[PDB]
Amino acid sequence: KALPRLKQRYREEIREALQQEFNYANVMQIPGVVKVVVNMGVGDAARDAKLINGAINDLALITGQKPEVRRARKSIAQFKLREGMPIGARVTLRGDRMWEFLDRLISIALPRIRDFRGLSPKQFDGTGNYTFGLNEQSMFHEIDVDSIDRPRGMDITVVTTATNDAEGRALLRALGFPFKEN
Template sequence: MSKKTPSLKKLYVEQVVPELVKSRGYKNKHEVPKLVKISINTGIDAEADKNQIADVQRDVAAIAGQKPVLAKSRKAIANFKLKQGQVVGCHVTLRSDAMWEFLYRLIAVALPTIRDFRGIPSKLDGQGNYNLGVTDHSIFPEISIENIKKHIGLDITIVTTAKSDDEGRELLRLLGMPFRRSEPVAPKAA
């Protein structure tokens, strides 16, 4: 039984790698930056009950395609009504084919459904990785709006092997990431 290659991975191998080799002048195809992993993270209210925690875990699992891990607090903080060992978040790390499938759904389906979408900021973290905050998880088609009791936000981190922000930005742009077009600044009238 042969496994089908994700379409975005196929695009990366057939078009993005040759384009980056040509534009950046890499001597070896292994120098070309590639995706390492995608991490999805969300926080859970300290006062959440077991049902809310299960709902968040179910929704993140539906979005990611694999079961997330619950993050627990390391120590008690009275001001935040937080006990040691209490569930405070949920995260999942995607690699290989699951990573490529999620990125395709994010770029092609989820981001364009955001109301008044004009692109995402093109600022990377200084090491070629991209962080994106999604304020409402219902933009993903896997989430049924009827079952949502509380909207959750997601932090999505795309980790690459790029050595600079410029390399990482070009890699993501060639993969189809809808970066915001920088508008030229109009000169001020004197």
């Protein structure tokens, strides 16, 4: 007994508009976002093993779920990197929590970037999966932006059952990502 904003919108308008654009036979062919992905590469694992915990805490406060700590399966010593050194955190988002996260991101933070002209239409890949990146976490009001001791940027990537970049960009437009309309 509840509905998020973007999901109600998705089931109302966007499916209709893509149908009226691309004319699929079955509606099962309709594109739909599955999951959302978050990652943070600490990179100074061999110099600060504590920024890892810092990033864990930030993403906790940001996404409302305890992250995963991705280990280094290979040992490349030109970076000090050794088998099992924690280099980064990672979180998966699916469902109502995902739609809420996109609502927050599109409505609070991305309208808080400094001189946001536009996210490119060219972060796609093969079929329409949008892989962008943030330099700082100085933007989410979710975050306690008084306590941060360093910039700890991140990298986001958005995956969809779309089959090509045209359908991907069209769907993400209907959903309200500020592309550079070109």
